[PDB]
Ligand binder design. Sequence first.
Ligand SMILES: [Cl-]
Ligand SMILES: [Cl-]
Ligand SMILES: [Cl-]
Ligand SMILES: [Cl-]
Ligand SMILES: [Cl-]
Ligand SMILES: [Cl-]
Ligand SMILES: [Cl-]
Ligand SMILES: [Mg+2]
Ligand SMILES: [Mg+2]
Ligand SMILES: [Mg+2]
Ligand SMILES: [Mg+2]
Ligand SMILES: [Mg+2]
Ligand SMILES: [Mg+2]
Ligand SMILES: [Mg+2]
Ligand SMILES: [Mg+2]
Ligand SMILES: [Mg+2]
Ligand SMILES: [Mg+2]
Ligand SMILES: [Mg+2]
Ligand SMILES: [Mg+2]
Ligand code: NA
Ligand code: NA
Ligand code: NA
Ligand code: NA
Ligand code: NA
Ligand code: NA
Ligand code: NA
Ligand code: NA
Ligand code: NA
Ligand code: NA
Ligand code: NA
Ligand code: NA
Ligand SMILES: [Sr+2]
Ligand SMILES: [Sr+2]
Ligand SMILES: [Sr+2]
Ligand SMILES: [Sr+2]
Ligand SMILES: [Sr+2]
Ligand SMILES: [Sr+2]
Ligand SMILES: [Sr+2]
Ligand SMILES: [Sr+2]
Ligand SMILES: [Sr+2]
Ligand SMILES: [Sr+2]
Lengths: 49, 142, 150, 142
Amino acid sequence: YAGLRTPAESFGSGRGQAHVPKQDGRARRVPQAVKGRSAHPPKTEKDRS
Amino acid sequence: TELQARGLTEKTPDLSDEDARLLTQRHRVGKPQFNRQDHHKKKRVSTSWRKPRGQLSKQRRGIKGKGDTVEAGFRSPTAVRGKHPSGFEEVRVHNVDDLEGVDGDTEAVRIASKVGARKRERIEEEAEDAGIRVLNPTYVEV
Amino acid sequence: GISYSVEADPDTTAKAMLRERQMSFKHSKAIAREIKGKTAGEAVDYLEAVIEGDQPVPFKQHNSGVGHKSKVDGWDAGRYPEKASKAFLDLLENAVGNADHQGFDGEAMTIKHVAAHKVGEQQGRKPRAMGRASAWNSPQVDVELILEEP
Amino acid sequence: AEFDADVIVDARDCIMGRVASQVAEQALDGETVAVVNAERAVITGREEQIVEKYEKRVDIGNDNGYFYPKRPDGIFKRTIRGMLPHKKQRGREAFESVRVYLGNPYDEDGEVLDGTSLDRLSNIKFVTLGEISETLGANKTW
RNA sequence: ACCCUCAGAAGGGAGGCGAAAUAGAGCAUGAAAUCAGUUGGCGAUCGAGCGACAGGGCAUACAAGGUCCCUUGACGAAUGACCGAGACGCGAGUCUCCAGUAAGACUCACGGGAAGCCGAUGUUCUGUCGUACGUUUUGAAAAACGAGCCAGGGAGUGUGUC
RNA sequence: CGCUCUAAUUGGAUGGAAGCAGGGGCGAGAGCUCCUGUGGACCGAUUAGUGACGAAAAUCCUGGCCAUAGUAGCAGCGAUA
Ligand SMILES: [Cl-]
Ligand SMILES: [Cl-]
Ligand SMILES: [Cl-]
Ligand SMILES: [Cl-]
Ligand SMILES: [Cl-]
Ligand SMILES: [Cl-]
Ligand SMILES: [Cl-]
Ligand SMILES: [Mg+2]
Ligand SMILES: [Mg+2]
Ligand SMILES: [Mg+2]
Ligand SMILES: [Mg+2]
Ligand SMILES: [Mg+2]
Ligand SMILES: [Mg+2]
Ligand SMILES: [Mg+2]
Ligand SMILES: [Mg+2]
Ligand SMILES: [Mg+2]
Ligand SMILES: [Mg+2]
Ligand SMILES: [Mg+2]
Ligand SMILES: [Mg+2]
Ligand code: NA
Ligand code: NA
Ligand code: NA
Ligand code: NA
Ligand code: NA
Ligand code: NA
Ligand code: NA
Ligand code: NA
Ligand code: NA
Ligand code: NA
Ligand code: NA
Ligand code: NA
Ligand SMILES: [Sr+2]
Ligand SMILES: [Sr+2]
Ligand SMILES: [Sr+2]
Ligand SMILES: [Sr+2]
Ligand SMILES: [Sr+2]
Ligand SMILES: [Sr+2]
Ligand SMILES: [Sr+2]
Ligand SMILES: [Sr+2]
Ligand SMILES: [Sr+2]
Ligand SMILES: [Sr+2]
């Protein structure tokens, strides 16, 4: 759940802003956002044997 | 009272006529800079070469003036490719044991930068005696 | 902060510096530019003429909208920045002082070097319409001075 | 004010365009030319139409401006400038080393470049730069 | 610490400590954007994808590159003469012989020379070509879309089955 | 070609490692390497592996910064001080 612990929503079109989930004006969750989730991270479920 | 470099600084390798010709060719023909397109138009774009990939890219489309695009046709001659401009074949050396097996008539030696001043001294004297030129010599005052 | 950006022989030179001064950085370049080369004393008499409004300081780089001044020579624009000028007087006071405490002739000495450097901004905020606030900062200026025997 | 011309051309009874073409090439060859008797230079055609074309050049214009000469003086000079890349260093150099004069301010007598002569006994439809300048409204200083 | 300066527990100067203060308090290192000062080049008569490739100016401590220029000669691919002689054509000019000769890019040798001199680097001038980049599109310099600049961040991953 | 960490083999460093700055050389190129200065403690190569591995772009994210500009505002309200 890392980086997923936020209710950040995107403002959409309207304020010359890129559609990126923000919270308290801080961008997020999304992988390209600092403090966001990792897109394709290491996974426990992976069989490393 | 003056600086002088250790080793056989002036030593030249002995090449075949053909090699000497090709080396000379390489030096005369040279090659284009091959820097990434428009690297000069934006500071955030490094000089490091990247294939022009734009569908409309002027360079990719090969328009005269937009610079050459990397092709095998630009390779240097097999026979001299990679030689020091002197003609020698460089040998990366990290210690004295590395000098063993080197032919000073063809190869010249280059001491890794990491190698400290103490070990360079040994390596430099042992190399001279084996008749091997050291490309990056120490300059002492004599 | 800054460090003297120029070499100075301790036996024929005296130094001085201002630190984090809240005053126009733009006016400082103008003044530095203008007095460099002069004599400590000449410099002071000059800055006093400026603070007094009898001698304008040429604004060659930061001159948008600045009205022309007839006394400005070889140029048109600029003004009389008394605040920054005063800060420079404090610098020369310090410079000449040191110089003297060292045996030199403070005033007679030449302003070999003198440059201002924006060392930072003291940040402030100002409320605006529509529930928004914008920056309202103060420049922080450093300046170096080097006097040298004529 | 004195012009050490290497060459002095006599424009009198000569086809302007053809004289202009040679003085252009020569200037580009380093020659310093002086076209004399500009007012007596001649351009072929039907006077009415010719004058119509030069009047339009006088009427053309706007704030940017299209300054067009009326004196036979020079343009003739303009005719030459139009055969020279006058906006390039070399071109401007050539152009500035060419001067046109009303009458002949020299003691010598300009030569007549070959192929540029109009035989008045075999032609009725031609005009004189002076005649054009007069129509254009120039004050006949010459 | 002491001293000097200053309205001054500020700051500044000098000074002491330490291998180091350019380790003196968000105090290891200290990139880019960017600012001040300064150096080289250009510069108040001249034109705009900013350059690539050539070639000239000016500039350059050492090191890590050492070549470069002119006489002559040797070799000499394709190409390839002048002149002279003879013969055609109204003429521009052509043919035949001289002759596939002289010439001919690269490379080498002799002799002479260069050390800002050759390379290279900075900038600038000349020549040729040249209306970014990525995307959308039949068609983009586009009066179609994206970005003020820089740094760092930013997209084929796991399980099961075939 | 380059990046991380693992392993075997094998090397460099306080007689100065990595990094950074300017500069020299090699490679068609990804990129490799040397010199000088700074730095003051770590760094490689080969082979087999490992992958949270390569950015100019997304009105992309965060931080920092320039021009804008010494510019607009610091006048307007029946309370002109
Ligand atoms: Cl290959
Ligand atoms: Cl400012
Ligand atoms: Cl007009
Ligand atoms: Cl032109
Ligand atoms: Cl007629
Ligand atoms: Cl050859
Ligand atoms: Cl893929
Ligand atoms: Mg995170
Ligand atoms: Mg760049
Ligand atoms: Mg104004
Ligand atoms: Mg409100
Ligand atoms: Mg620090
Ligand atoms: Mg369409
Ligand atoms: Mg091994
Ligand atoms: Mg991309
Ligand atoms: Mg990255
Ligand atoms: Mg931002
Ligand atoms: Mg304005
Ligand atoms: Mg009142
Ligand atoms: Na939370
Ligand atoms: Na598992
Ligand atoms: Na201005
Ligand atoms: Na004036
Ligand atoms: Na004046
Ligand atoms: Na005509
Ligand atoms: Na006109
Ligand atoms: Na150059
Ligand atoms: Na698009
Ligand atoms: Na495009
Ligand atoms: Na368009
Ligand atoms: Na934006
Ligand atoms: Sr809408
Ligand atoms: Sr080293
Ligand atoms: Sr300005
Ligand atoms: Sr001609
Ligand atoms: Sr001190
Ligand atoms: Sr144009
Ligand atoms: Sr031959
Ligand atoms: Sr990634
Ligand atoms: Sr600002
Ligand atoms: Sr008021």
